[PDB]
Design a protein around this ligand. Structure first.
Ligand code: 5WZ
Length: 109
């Protein structure tokens, strides 16, 4: 299936992203205990667990929707954290890896 093909390819890309050694900050929703005013500042939180559930719920009917959610993980991180923080550094490493996986899979809209 074109729908099941898309699902299979996204599932593979998302699982590879999640397994990456730089993914650890992004694995689950940001915890207030670690960032008490986070949710006062970041209006569209996103994380890889939430993406995994969205994928399982057949939300990602296009490349565009999947890219927007992963890209939001990164933009939240860079909005919130200084550039020389480990979080920012992880974001840019994981983004490079993400793009290489999108390209390796031939994913197009
Ligand atoms: N003290 C940190 C805790 C984790 N935060 C994040 O932005 C991580 C990257 C997702 C908020 C600030």
């Amino acid at each position: 299936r074109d729908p099941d093909q898309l699902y299979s390819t996204l599932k593979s890309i998302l699982q590879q992203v999640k397994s990456h050694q730089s993914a650890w900050p992004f694995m689950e929703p940001v915890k207030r205990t670690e960032a008490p005013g986070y949710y006062e500042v970041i209006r569209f939180p996103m994380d890889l667990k939430t993406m995994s559930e969205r994928l399982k719920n057949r939300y990602y009917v296009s490349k565009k929707l999947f890219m927007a959610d992963l890209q939001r993980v990164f933009t939240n991180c860079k909005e919130y954290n200084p550039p020389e923080s480990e979080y920012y550094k992880c974001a840019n490493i994981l983004e490079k890896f993400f793009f290489s996986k999108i390209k390796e899979a031939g994913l197009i809209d």
